[PDB]
Amino acid sequence: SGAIYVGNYRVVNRHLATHNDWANLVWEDSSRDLLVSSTTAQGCDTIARCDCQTGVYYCSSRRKHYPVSFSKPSLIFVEASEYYPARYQSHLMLAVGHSEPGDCGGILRCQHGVVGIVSTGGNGLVGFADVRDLLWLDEE
Numbered sequence: 514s515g516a517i518y519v520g521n522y523r524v525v526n527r528h529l530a531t532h533n534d535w536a537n538l539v540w541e542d543s544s545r546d547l548l549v550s551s552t553t554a555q556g557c558d559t560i561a562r563c564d565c566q567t568g569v570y571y572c573s574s575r576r577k578h579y580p581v582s583f584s585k586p587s588l589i590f591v592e593a594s595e596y597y598p599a600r601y602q603s604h605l606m607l608a609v610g611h612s613e614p615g616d617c618g619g620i621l622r623c624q625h626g627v628v629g630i631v632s633t634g635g636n637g638l639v640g641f642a643d644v645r646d647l648l649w650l651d652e653e
């Protein structure tokens with residue numbers, strides 16, 4: 514679990530969006546596993562606006578922050594699960610690292626801020642849903 518809090522927005526994995534989130538929807542994209550909901554209180558996360566391919570992610574299943582090299586956002590095939598049928602997920606970045614289902618929501622960060630959140634994994638890999646292209650997150 515985990516979320517990004519920037520301005521009056523809460524960014525979470527779409528598959529983990531609570532009942533309170535859909536009743537306050539701003540934007541969602543199933544093909545990106547992302548959902549953004551409005552918040553009453555202002556958040557303090559800064560979104561990165563860069564093309565960094567190295568960063569640090571939080572892994573809840575190990576209670577540890579790991580440094581990683583990650584690929585550029587891409588259209589990647591993601592195996593069927595209890596949340597989605599087998600499909601291509603867009604704006605996905607992969608890294609060699611540990612992850613388990615309960616790890617989605619963990620933040621990936623570089624020297625410029627929040628890059629994205631854990632969204633996929635398996636086989637000694639971890640996938641992150643990129644948020645750096647969502648320029649509107651900086652304004653309202």
Ligand SMILES: CSc1ccccc1CC(=O)N1CCO[C@H](C(N)=O)C1
Binds near residue numbers: 546595617632
């Ligand atoms: C850190 S996720 C993980 C890790 C190890 C093994 C398996 C998983 C689960 C996983 O990859 N998915 C289930 C939830 O929906 C995801 C999606 N964005 O389509 C995909």
Ligand SMILES: [Zn+2]
Binds near residue numbers: 564565623626
């Ligand atoms: Zn950066």
